[PDB]
A paper describes a structure:
Among families of proteins involved in signal transduction, phospholipase C (PLC) enzymes that generate second messengers from phosphatidylinositol 4,5-bisphosphate (PIP2) incorporate a number of different protein modules. PLCγ enzymes (PLCγ1 and PLCγ2), for example, contain eight domains, four of which are unique to this PLC family (Bunney and Katan, 2011; Suh et al., 2008). The PLCγ ‘specific array’ of domains (γSA), comprising a “split” PH (spPH) domain flanking two tandem SH2 domains and an SH3 domain, is inserted between the two halves (X and Y) of the TIM-barrel catalytic domain (Bunney and Katan, 2011). We demonstrate that among four domains present in the γSA, the cSH2 domain and its C-terminal linker provide a focus for most interdomain interactions both within the γSA and between the γSA and the PLC-core.
Author numbering: 547 to 558, 560 to 772, 783 to 789
């Protein structure tokens, strides 16, 4: 499901963010040479760049994108042309890339750590009091949100459990997120697990809260009523 596709990386700092992302994944996990990602190009409108690992250095290759006869054509060199980025990546995963100086096959994909950012339950800027206030407006067990904390790589799941509002501390520790001692690959994956399994005393993550969700359910400032999550 396009794990290696990162889209736009802020602005056209995108090259440096790619490099950072790759150095982080490759050094923490001990990834092989050829570990990569695809993102939008900084210099070439409508093209992409394939950024990959080479023993501490990262190589950038332009993936030219044509619309010829209303049929997208992604390619690295005029000689070999593809129909999808999946085919190109999957082909260069098997056949080695020719880059003049060296040759290299694409290895493992470097995944995004920030898919949570677009999710409805995610607030990049919400104090604990602001989470509590919004959670008081939803008198429902299972109502939740994920809020970013002031420190980098630190979050909280703020939820309504048995009428009270409690808070769980989540920590991004490199390429995984930690909830106490429980480890997940991402904040997204943690939330999916806790939508199916109880986060705190038989309470699952049921209703994601934001301003739109409040217009639907939500009331007008009612009920004036950190915690350990369930392991596994």
């Amino acid at each position: 499901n396009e794990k290696w596709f990162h889209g736009k990386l802020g602005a056209g700092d995108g090259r440096h963010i790619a490099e950072r992302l790759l150095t982080e994944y490759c050094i923490e996990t001990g990834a092989p040479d050829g570990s990569f990602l695809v993102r939008e190009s900084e210099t070439f409108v409508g093209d992409y760049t394939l950024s990959f690992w080479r023993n501490g250095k990262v190589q950038h290759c332009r993936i030219h994108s044509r619309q010829d006869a209303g049929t997208p054509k992604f390619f690295l060199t005029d000689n070999l042309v593809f129909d999808s980025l999946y085919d190109l990546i999957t082909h260069y995963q098997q056949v080695p890339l020719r880059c003049n100086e060296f040759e290299m096959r694409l290895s493992e994909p470097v995944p995004q750590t920030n898919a949570h950012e677009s999710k409805e339950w995610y607030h990049a800027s919400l104090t604990r009091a602001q989470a509590e206030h919004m959670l008081m407006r939803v008198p429902r067990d299972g109502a939740f949100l994920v809020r970013k904390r002031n420190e980098p790589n630190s979050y909280a799941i703020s939820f309504r459990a048995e009428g009270k509002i409690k808070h769980c501390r989540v920590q991004q520790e490199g390429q995984t997120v930690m909830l106490g001692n429980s480890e997940f690959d991402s904040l997204v994956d943690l939330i999916s697990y806790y939508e199916k399994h109880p986060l705190y005393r038989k309470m699952k993550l049921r209703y994601p809260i934001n301003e739109e969700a409040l217009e639907k359910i939500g009331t007008a400032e009612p009920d004036y009523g950190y915690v350990e999550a369930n392991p596994m």
